């Protein structure tokens, strides 16, 4: 499977039945239906002792590997019940500026789509924790075009040395941090993983607030590669899926 004309999220189907399940994402985000729950607690981000390790080109993204083998980058609190660790990670993106995210708020599309991804602890580790419905946690975060985040950077400079997919370098001591945006409201609802197998383990938090990257940095997005340094050039672009049905669900918004 893949995201290209013949493999693409349409496909998914075939190979991975729940692609048509109940729980699926990503999906459009209705700002005037989602109901405001006074009920949520606060999230709570703990990345001061967050640990990265890795980045590598998996030939769907770039992940930015953390260790996980303990409670030092975590999230809690909000619809959250639990420790859940971060343990990678990664973006979607277009091959324009207008499309390239995976959730849409009113169906509006951003050039991106970062991906923080935490497992909850209960649960031992990462492949027992997707098999639950309330196994991960991830953190959603859109980007826009126009002035260039300094905190990543660190991360387009290296882009360069995991063009294709199999390769991977060191990356120590990245700071998370720098991602997140201002403010920390946000809409909240149970999906599945965007990329098979798609499990629908994951409690879904998209933050509100977007976060502004330089063109040039989106640029050198674009310039990596699905294939291995084997295979003809095929550019990693538009590597998101499209939204699907909300069926029996409702979006929680933390704020009003
Ligand atoms: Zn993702």
Same mark, same amino acid.
């Given at each position: 499977?893949?995201?290209?004309?013949?493999?693409?999220?349409?496909?998914?189907?075939?190979?991975?039945?729940?692609?048509? +399940?109940?729980?699926?994402?990503? %999906?459009?985000?209705?700002?005037?239906? $989602?109901?405001?729950?006074?009920? =949520? /607690?606060?999230? *709570?981000?703990?990345?001061?002792?967050?640990?990265?390790?890795?980045?590598?080109?998996?030939?769907?993204?770039?992940?930015?590997?953390?260790?996980?083998?303990?409670?030092?980058?975590?999230?809690?609190?909000?619809?959250?019940?639990?420790?859940?660790?971060?343990?990678?990670?990664?973006?979607?993106?277009?091959?324009?500026?207008?499309?390239?995210?995976?959730?849409?708020?009113?169906?509006?599309?951003?050039?991106?789509?970062?991906?923080?991804?935490?497992?909850?602890?209960?649960? +031992?580790?990462?492949?027992?924790? %997707?098999?639950?419905?309330?196994?991960? $946690?991830?953190?959603?975060?859109? =980007? /826009?075009?126009? *002035?260039?985040?300094?905190?990543?950077?660190?991360?387009?400079?290296?882009?360069?040395?995991?063009?294709?997919?199999?390769?991977?370098?060191?990356?120590?001591?990245?700071?998370?941090?720098?991602?997140?945006?201002?403010?920390?409201?946000?809409?909240?609802?149970?999906?599945?993983?965007?990329?098979?197998?798609?499990?629908?383990?994951?409690?879904?938090?998209?933050?509100?607030?977007?976060?502004?990257?330089?063109?040039?940095?989106?640029?050198?997005?674009?310039?990596?590669?699905?294939?291995?340094?084997?295979?003809?050039?095929?550019?990693?672009?538009?590597?998101?899926?499209?939204?699907?049905? =909300? /069926?029996?669900?409702?979006?929680?918004?933390?704020?009003?």
């Amino acid at each position: 499977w893949g995201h290209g004309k013949h493999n693409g999220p349409e496909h998914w189907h075939k190979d991975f039945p729940i692609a048509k +399940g109940e729980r699926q994402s990503p %999906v459009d985000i209705d700002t005037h239906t $989602a109901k405001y729950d006074p009920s =949520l /607690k606060p999230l *709570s981000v703990s990345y001061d002792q967050a640990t990265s390790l890795r980045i590598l080109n998996n030939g769907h993204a770039f992940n930015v590997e953390f260790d996980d083998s303990q409670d030092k980058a975590v999230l809690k609190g909000g619809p959250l019940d639990g420790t859940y660790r971060l343990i990678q990670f990664h973006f979607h993106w277009g091959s324009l500026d207008g499309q390239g995210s995976e959730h849409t708020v009113d169906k509006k599309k951003y050039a991106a789509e970062l991906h923080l991804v935490h497992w909850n602890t209960k649960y +031992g580790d990462f492949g027992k924790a %997707v098999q639950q419905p309330d196994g991960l $946690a991830v953190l959603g975060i859109f =980007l /826009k075009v126009g *002035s260039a985040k300094p905190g990543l950077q660190k991360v387009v400079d290296v882009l360069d040395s995991i063009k294709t997919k199999g390769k991977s370098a060191d990356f120590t001591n990245f700071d998370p941090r720098g991602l997140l945006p201002e403010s920390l409201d946000y809409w909240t609802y149970p999906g599945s993983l965007t990329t098979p197998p798609l499990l629908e383990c994951v409690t879904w938090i998209v933050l509100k607030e977007p976060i502004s990257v330089s063109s040039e940095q989106v640029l050198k997005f674009r310039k990596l590669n699905f294939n291995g340094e084997g295979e003809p050039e095929e550019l990693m672009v538009d590597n998101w899926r499209p939204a699907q049905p =909300l /069926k029996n669900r409702q979006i929680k918004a933390s704020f009003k």
